[PDB]
């Protein structure tokens, strides 16, 4: 069983793929908190552009909301909703400057 | 439309997920080469363990083979086969030491 070339290329080319982002990233100065789960499944731009002078980056986007447990150690905890950025379309633009 | 908590948790917990790895990583001193595509789609261990003292890591593995274009700049180029490591099962083991 061998993955054929065009099939590899098509599957690895810059496109939106289910990715698992840490929430500390997506939410900046929320260190008065710990999250459960600590990460979340977001669609996000991935793979390569078959080139060193090209990077894969978001052109279209869309917000999704998620039930997260916002623990605040030594005080308390509650389930709240928490929106994250989700990439809907990708494009191989030129490396930043 | 709101992702329910247990559904987020189940989807983001340490498990094998289609990931897009650079080939320079998986193949070390092959810098007498450039690859097309430059990356490949491998199943790989991802998401979190809902904890700072725990990391997600491979326990079962399995090799997949792929048709890759091995360019060798200024000499030539040919399609060859190239095996990569693929994670079949994941587990939240304790952070290294």
């Amino acid at each position, epitope marked *: 069983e061998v993955v054929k070339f065009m099939d590899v290329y098509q599957r690895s080319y810059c496109h939106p793929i289910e990715t698992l982002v840490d929430i500390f990233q997506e939410y900046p100065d929320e260190i008065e908190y*710990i999250f*459960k789960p600590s990460c979340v499944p977001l669609m996000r731009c991935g793979g390569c552009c078959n080139d060193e002078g090209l990077e894969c980056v978001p052109t279209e986007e869309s917000n999704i909301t998620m*039930q997260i*447990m916002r*623990i*605040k*150690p*030594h*005080q*308390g*905890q*509650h*389930i709240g909703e928490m929106s994250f950025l989700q990439h809907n379309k990708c494009e191989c633009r030129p490396k930043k400057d | 439309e709101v992702v329910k*908590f*247990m559904d987020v*948790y189940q989807r983001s917990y340490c498990h094998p997920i289609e990931t897009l790895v650079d080939i320079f990583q998986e193949y070390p001193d092959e810098i007498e080469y450039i690859f097309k595509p430059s990356c490949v789609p491998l199943m790989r261990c991802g998401g979190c363990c809902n904890d700072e*003292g725990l990391e997600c890591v491979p326990t079962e593995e399995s090799n997949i083979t792929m048709q890759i274009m091995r360019i060798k700049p200024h000499q030539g180029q040919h399609i060859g086969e190239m095996s990569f490591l693929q994670h079949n099962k994941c587990e939240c083991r*304790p952070k290294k030491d």
Partner: antibody
Amino acid sequence: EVQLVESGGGLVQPGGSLRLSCAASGFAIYDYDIHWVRQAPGKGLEWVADIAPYAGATAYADSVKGRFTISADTSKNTAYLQMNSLRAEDTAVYYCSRSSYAYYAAMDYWGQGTLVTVSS
Amino acid sequence: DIQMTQSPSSLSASVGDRVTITCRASQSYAYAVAWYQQKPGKAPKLLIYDASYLYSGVPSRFSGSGSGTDFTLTISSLQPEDFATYYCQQAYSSPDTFGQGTKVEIKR
């Protein structure tokens, strides 16, 4: 202020059933993990069951599963331990608790407790 | 049972003594040790968690060590109201865990 208030303990012929109740107040049981922990006369602590509504996730101590079913009703902010098929060694002071990630899995509010006693 | 081995099972100590109950955990890392104080015919009251931290309103005379698997509740200046059964609990993966207990009493 938080408090847990249990009720429903009493006397039951062996092989019968009771319904213990754990009324909470001053916090959502939804957001936390609610436990039942019992104590036979003069002996120590034995965890029996627990519910975490947010996760939809329950659990049962080996000696008790099949017969007891823990449950919650978050509109009434009350948890419940329906016990069937009751035995002499089940006889105890049933305590209900609150566990959280905030206090690193520790059980920080317990109710006063009811006494279940299983005799003929 | 995710074991926990509490010792001593019971003890005496005159007022003001340095009393120290200890506990011995299962085979995992896992720092989720709590300590409770149970006065007779009464609900357990939480004292210390994650092994060192100290629930609100708990007196300064209680502390705890998280040192490998060897944990220690420690009452610097034992008091006439500290008579009770103290239970430890390793609670990281599950609650099926509770020390056997320690009836502390005053000597006088």
